[PDB]
């Protein structure tokens, strides 16, 4: 087994070389540069809407591109599409399998996707010649639970699963186009770049990877956490992303510098993060927690700026509209709230 | 809605109908009994689920007994990490755990040192003391009784438990196995374990499940009344 030993040594020395290059490229910190600018004021955000109707725990939600409609998924076997202005319910889709824990809304507004412990991603046609919502496709290529899914267009979707892989699908043919492998751990979250050329993922191996959709290759790997990564989100610029783990910390990574920039943590906080999101300008970083609260961070100074406390159970999902007017939080108490 | 247009009022009416349908479905689903079935591959889950009702990730089996509808969930196909989805089953009525008596001496194919019975005991300890199941009843089934009778005469139980000091007869060995399994529970007062030996019983395991579920339902009712 001398070949295996020499391969292990070569891999270790390559990792050491990469670490040394990252360290040599590291001059100063984000905090030192940012200390010049004035801090953001205290954030006073209030509940504006309360959406009722789900009769079990809520696991996921996604905003529409019009910043008015949204979709929510609950383990009562229901998908509900809401009108956030009038609080009205537009559609209620019954699910074949009630163990759903992800959902996505197509940018064209014509389709909705959901999946869970059935290892199947279902596609629903909202605009039908009849008056009902129909299933248009079922994608059944995974061997583990579905954790996340995001549309690229009306014909392409990217899913992540518990089989440690991510896959790109052709909806019309129902076949996998590309497979992304390399995590060696349960992949829990996805985040698409604004230009849709790349996407990032976070897995239970406490690592994050950047993939090229066209080439199907892993370009960069980021390792700064010591526990499972539950959520991930691109910076609005497209050159950074934030991760939330079970070690009660959030981190900011840079693609061009290829390393960590800043950490958001507090001694009084010991619970894990379930969801993260950015504001339109990227100045505010919103993270959901297991302590029933959602914290608003200052992305440039790592100083907490506000607290959203209106739920009496775990905050499971977050969402900010495309125009940046409102923020939505889901929870295990079966309620959605719109904060502004 | 005095300030609403005709289309807005029609949309509100549609939303009201959707709310009514959601409420009715939720009330219809509240009368079901949900069971989480756990164990190992060779434990006998298939035999039990066959007796109950005379790559997918979860299998749902529906059956009825005495005007009561039961839903059973099998999660044996999920080879991913259990701690990332076990919380979805918090709030289940009861857990059914299947163990084979005859596998006290056999070793797992994957690991030579590991024994099947100790692996089952480790899994039972992990599930019973889980923080999502601090108040959930457990129904324990011992699945291979006749094979236990055959193997106990030709081989002592001391190979599995080196500290077993008793007669190699079936009754004492079965009592020792049951007490070893029941000693893993730590709450004791909060939760209880139901045990039932099965070889080829006919329409008797369903009655045992019914009795345990009735006890759980009575406890829930007493919690609801506040008399608790």
């Amino acid at each position: 087994q001398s070949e295996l030993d020499q391969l292990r040594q070569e891999a270790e020395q390559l990792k050491n070389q990469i670490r040394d290059a990252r360290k040599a490229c590291a001059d100063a910190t984000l905090s030192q540069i940012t200390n010049n600018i004035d801090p953001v004021g205290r954030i006073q955000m209030r509940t504006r809407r309360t959406l009722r109707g789900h009769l079990a725990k809520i696991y996921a939600m996604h905003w529409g591109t019009d910043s008015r409609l949204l979709v929510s998924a609950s383990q009562d076997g229901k998908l509900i599409i809401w009108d956030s202005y009038t609080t009205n319910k537009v559609h209620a889709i019954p699910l074949r399998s009630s163990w759903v824990m992800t959902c996505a809304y197509a940018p064209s507004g014509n389709y909705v996707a959901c999946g869970g412990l059935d290892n199947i991603c279902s596609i629903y046609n909202l605009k039908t010649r009849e008056g009902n919502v129909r299933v248009s496709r079922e994608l059944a290529g995974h061997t583990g639970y579905l954790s996340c899914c995001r549309f690229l267009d009306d014909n392409q979707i990217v899913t992540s699963s518990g089989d440690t892989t991510c896959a790109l699908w052709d909806i019309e043919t129902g076949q996998q186009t590309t497979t992304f492998t390399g995590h060696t751990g349960d992949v829990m979250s996805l985040s698409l770049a604004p230009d849709t050329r790349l996407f990032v993922s976070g897995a239970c191996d406490a690592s994050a990877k950047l993939w090229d959709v066209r080439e199907g290759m892993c370009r960069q790997t980021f390792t700064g956490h010591e526990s499972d990564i539950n959520a991930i989100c691109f910076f609005p610029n497209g050159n950074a992303f934030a991760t939330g783990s079970d070690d009660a910390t959030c981190r900011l990574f840079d693609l061009r510098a290829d390393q960590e920039l800043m950490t958001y943590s507090h001694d009084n906080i010991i619970c894990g993060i379930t969801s993260v999101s950015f504001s339109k300008s990227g100045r505010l970083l919103l993270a959901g927690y297991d302590d029933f609260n959602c914290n608003v961070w200052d992305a440039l100074k790592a100083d907490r700026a506000g607290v959203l406390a209106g739920h009496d159970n775990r905050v499971s999902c977050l969402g900010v509209t495309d125009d940046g007017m409102a923020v939505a939080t889901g929870s295990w108490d079966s309620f959605l709230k719109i904060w502004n | 809605g005095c300030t609403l247009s005709a289309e807005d009022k029609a949309a509100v009416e549609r939303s009201k109908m959707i709310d009514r349908n959601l409420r009715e479905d939720g009330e219809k689903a509240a009368r079901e009994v949900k069971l989480l079935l756990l164990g190992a591959g060779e434990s006998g889950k298939n035999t039990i689920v066959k007796q109950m009702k005379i790559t997918t990730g979860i299998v749902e089996t529906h059956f009825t007994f005495k005007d009561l509808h039961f839903k059973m969930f099998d999660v044996g196909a999920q080879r991913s990490e259990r701690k990332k989805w076990i919380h979805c089953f918090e709030g289940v009525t009861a857990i059914i755990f299947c163990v084979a008596l005859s596998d006290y001496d056999l070793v797992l194919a994957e690991d030579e040192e590991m024994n099947r019975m100790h692996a089952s005991m480790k899994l039972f300890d992990s599930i019973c003391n889980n923080k999502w199941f601090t108040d959930t009843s457990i129904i324990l089934f011992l699945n291979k009784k006749d094979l236990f009778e055959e193997k106990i005469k030709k081989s002592p139980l001391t190979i599995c438990y080196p500290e077993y000091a008793g007669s190699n007869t079936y009754e004492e060995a079965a009592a020792y196995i049951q007490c070893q399994f029941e000693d893993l529970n730590k709450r004791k007062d909060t939760k209880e374990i139901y045990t039932h030996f099965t070889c080829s019983t006919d329409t008797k395991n369903v009655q045992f499940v019914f009795d345990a579920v009735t006890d759980v339902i009575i406890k829930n009712n007493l919690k609801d009344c506040g008399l608790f």
Partner: single-chain antibody
Amino acid sequence: MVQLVESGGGLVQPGGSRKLSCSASGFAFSSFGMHWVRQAPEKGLEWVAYISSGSGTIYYADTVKGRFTISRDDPKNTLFLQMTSLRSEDTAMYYCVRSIYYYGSSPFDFWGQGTTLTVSSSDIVMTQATSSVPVTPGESVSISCRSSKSLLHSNGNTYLYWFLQRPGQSPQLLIYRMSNLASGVPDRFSGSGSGTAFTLTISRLEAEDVGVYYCMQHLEYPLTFGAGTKLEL
């Protein structure tokens, strides 16, 4: 696959009673509201009655109120209209129209092939000044409709509908809420307006675009149609 077929009609003695029925197939009937729309010979359209999904809400036109009643049979996928004390001006063709109401829907998007009833012998006023426009293929034309009251609601949308009736056929929706194209309409129809004056533009007119154009307001009940505007070669 959507289809609507009506039954009933024929010669009627004055003062008699009949029941019109329509049968639906190819869509979720219980989820749609139902309208009855009347068109007298050589005359424009006139709304009659409306029954909501779930039968919660029912409206009538003041002309037929008390004499006409409307009902649904959801399991059989049927719509009814029982008429009593029929008089001379009830003689017309009766259409059945489906409509669904939620954020972003398209009401009045399918019309049935109505039947003919022959009988022996404030509200918003929508007006179209022009009654005929001579057209030739390849030419752009504009149709104008005017409203007595402003149709712009405080929610930000204007409740104006444009319909087309080809000779010998049923009316077809073209524009809903003054700017939106229907599902199967070519991108040569455009609509615009401001409060009380509205216009419909047909760029690159073709031989298929010949018929009568009707404007409708959906701001409040009763629903009123404008006069026709016929295009001829």
